[PDB]
Amino acid sequence: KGRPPGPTPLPVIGNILQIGIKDISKSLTNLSKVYGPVFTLYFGLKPIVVLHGYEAVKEALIDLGEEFSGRGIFPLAERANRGFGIVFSNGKKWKEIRRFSLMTLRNFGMGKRSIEDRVQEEARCLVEELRKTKASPCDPTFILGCAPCNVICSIIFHKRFDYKDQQFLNLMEKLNENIEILSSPWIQVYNNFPALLDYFPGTHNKLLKNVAFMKSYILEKVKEHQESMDMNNPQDFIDCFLMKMEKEKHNQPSEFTIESLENTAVDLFGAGTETTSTTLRYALLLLLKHPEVTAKVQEEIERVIGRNRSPCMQDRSHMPYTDAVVHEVQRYIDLLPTSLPHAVTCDIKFRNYLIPKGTTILISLTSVLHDNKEFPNPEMFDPHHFLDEGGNFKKSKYFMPFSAGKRICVGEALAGMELFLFLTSILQNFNLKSLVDPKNLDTTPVVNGFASVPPFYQLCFIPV
């Protein structure tokens, strides 16, 4: 017709009654059966266009990539973000900062030391810290959160920290606080009613204070770098950004500034820590529930890699089962069910519907990741979803946990390295033991807002 169809919204409240609050993804799936793959929803007064199923997602994100390359900024994000980096940036500001970040985040994008070497050092440090637990019951939340944060610390400041260093503990405290705030179920009420942000500013003020603390901490590092930076010899992301700024002195306007560097660094810490941490925490929980899966991974680790050397990225192609398990964890868990909000760059005609410039687009990653035809029994954890009859790795165009198109995760290659290297290192050195027993523990995702998190669990890391 003209505009995508949808349920008639109620005045002021919008479509909140149909969407709900607990499971947003199931509501979008039910609405798609009534309104089709392209439908309109109202988050208060804000019109949102939801894309359900692979065909609609692939046509928008890949075929009309540039048109759907914009980032939709919700009321809370708008108030909690003073200055943009990469995540909430748009236009030429986003295009330049993203292109720089992608080139810098390549394996050999920051001088002599590789991204892999930084992850490999962290994987070795992770094992040493799990060894300190003395095979006693523990909540892995803290230890599994330390490694991805330290990888970004090693990428931004060229040096990792001891899991006891106060400045590292402070940085993690601000990141965990911000995630707890963003993952609080009553937060979407601010997006449905942007007026409530003015009457109840306590939420966004706390996010602003933690971001300002992180920005100022990063500012100390950029000054230390400016003091000892050697041009022609970069060691990290800051060094690469400062020399890009030197190349930008001619044609002064510049998208690359000390301010934009602080914003990009906090974005990389925010988007790169909890995503990887939660996936690792969920992976270990799923490995406890399925010890037969864990045993087959350990068989591959013992045969391809030994016990006398650390795992590397070259081992992955020779390890189809382990690669399938990693892919299955990401596919099953559906970490970001609706990804990050998108926005249309210009007025476009999509599926015989007119979507005007700046309209917020919600990509249902669940509809792709949990496709019934591509993954028979999609609500069940099964490495066979990424395996053929012979046990060889079976790729899927439906594997979109990092989303797709122009806005695809900048840390896709990094997260892949971290997930593979950390999990193989843990299972090479330790056997996972549950105090509750495999039958008793629940692995069903706890969807509270716009992120899937595992339930609380404890486990023993027994050395092999």
Ligand X SMILES: C[C@@](O)(C(=O)Nc1ccc(S(=O)(=O)c2cccc(Br)c2)cc1Cl)C(F)(F)F
Pick from 145, 272, 311, 445 the residue near ligand HEM by CB under 6 A. Answer: 272
CB of 437 to ligand X, least distance (A): 27
Binding mask 93-112 for ligand HEM (x = CB under 6 A): -----x--------------
Write the CA distances from 458 to 48, 66, 164, 420, 437, integer angstroms: 40, 45, 22, 22, 11
Task: Determine whether 405 is exposed, middle or buried from the number of CB atoms within 10 Å of its CB (0-12, 13-18, 19+).
Answer: buried
Task: Determine whether 400 is exposed, middle or buried from the number of CB atoms within 10 Å of its CB (0-12, 13-18, 19+).
Answer: buried
According to the binding rule CB under 6 A, does residue 149 interact with ligand HEM? no
Pick from 276, 322, 424, 434 the residue near ligand HEM by CB under 6 A. Answer: 276
Task: Determine whether 133 is exposed, middle or buried from the number of CB atoms within 10 Å of its CB (0-12, 13-18, 19+).
Answer: middle
* Cβ nearer to ligand X, comparing 206 with 384: 206
According to the binding rule CB under 6 A, does residue 118 interact with ligand HEM? no
Amino acid sitting at position 204: H
- Residues 179 and 444: beta-carbon distance below 8 Å: no
| CA separation for the pair 150, 144 (Å, rounded) | 11
CB of 13 to ligand HEM, least distance (A): 28
Write the CA distances from 462 to 131, 363, 459, integer angstroms: 8, 41, 9
Q: Which of 85, 73, 74 is nearest to 214 (CA)?
A: 85
Q: Which stretch binds ligand HEM (CB under 6 A): 24-32, 33-41, 44-52, 403-411?
A: 403-411
Name the token pair of 300. 């591959």
Three-class SS of residue 437? Answer: coil
According to the binding rule CB under 6 A, does residue 171 interact with ligand X? no
- Residues 155 and 115: beta-carbon distance below 8 Å: yes
Which 207-266 residues touch ligand X, going by CB under 6 A?
A: 207, 211, 266
Is 409 annotated as contributing to ligand binding? yes
Task: Determine whether 236 is exposed, middle or buried from the number of CB atoms within 10 Å of its CB (0-12, 13-18, 19+).
Answer: buried
CB of 144 to ligand X, least distance (A): 12
According to the binding rule CB under 6 A, does residue 282 interact with ligand HEM? no
According to the binding rule CB under 6 A, does residue 402 interact with ligand HEM? yes
Residue 200 C-beta-side C-alpha neighbours within 13 Å: 11
According to the binding rule CB under 6 A, does residue 410 interact with ligand HEM? yes
Which 378-397 residues touch ligand X, going by CB under 6 A?
A: none
Binding mask 321-360 for ligand HEM (x = CB under 6 A): --------------xx--xx--------------------
- Residues 147 and 122: beta-carbon distance below 8 Å: yes
According to the binding rule CB under 6 A, does residue 271 interact with ligand X? yes
What phi and psi values does residue 318 have, to the nearest 5 degrees?
A: -90, 0
Q: How far apart are the first and last CA of the chain?
A: 63
If binding means CB under 6 A, how many residues of this protein chain bind ligand HEM? 24
If binding means CB under 6 A, how many residues of this protein chain bind ligand X? 18
Which one of ligand X, ligand HEM, none interacts with residue 270, CB within 5 to 8 A by kind?
Answer: ligand X
* Cβ nearer to ligand X, comparing 50 with 355: 50
Name the token pair of 456. 């609380």
CB of 190 to ligand X, least distance (A): 12
Pick from 122, 236, 239, 267 the residue near ligand HEM by CB under 6 A. Answer: 267
CB of 307 to ligand HEM, least distance (A): 27
Q: Which stretch binds ligand HEM (CB under 6 A): 169-177, 247-255, 273-281, 346-354?
A: 273-281
Which 65-104 residues touch ligand X, going by CB under 6 A?
A: 77, 80-81, 87
- Residues 411 and 268: beta-carbon distance below 8 Å: yes
Which one of ligand X, ligand HEM, none interacts with residue 276, CB within 5 to 8 A by kind?
Answer: ligand HEM
Which 178-207 residues touch ligand X, going by CB under 6 A?
A: 178-179, 182-183, 207
According to the binding rule CB under 6 A, does residue 415 interact with ligand HEM? yes
Helices 412-429 and 291-304: crossing angle, nearest 10°? 90
According to the binding rule CB under 6 A, does residue 274 interact with ligand X? yes
Helix, strand, coil share (%) of the chain residues, nearest 5: 50, 10, 40
8-state DSSP, 11: T
Binding site for ligand HEM (CB under 6 A): 71, 86-87, 98, 267-268, 271-272, 275-276, 279, 335-336, 339-340, 401-403, 407, 409-411, 414-415
Binding-site residues from annotation for heme = 409
Q: Where along the sequence are the contacts to ligand X (CB under 6 A)? A: 77, 80-81, 87, 178-179, 182-183, 207, 211, 266, 270-271, 274-275, 278, 336, 451
Binding residues: 409
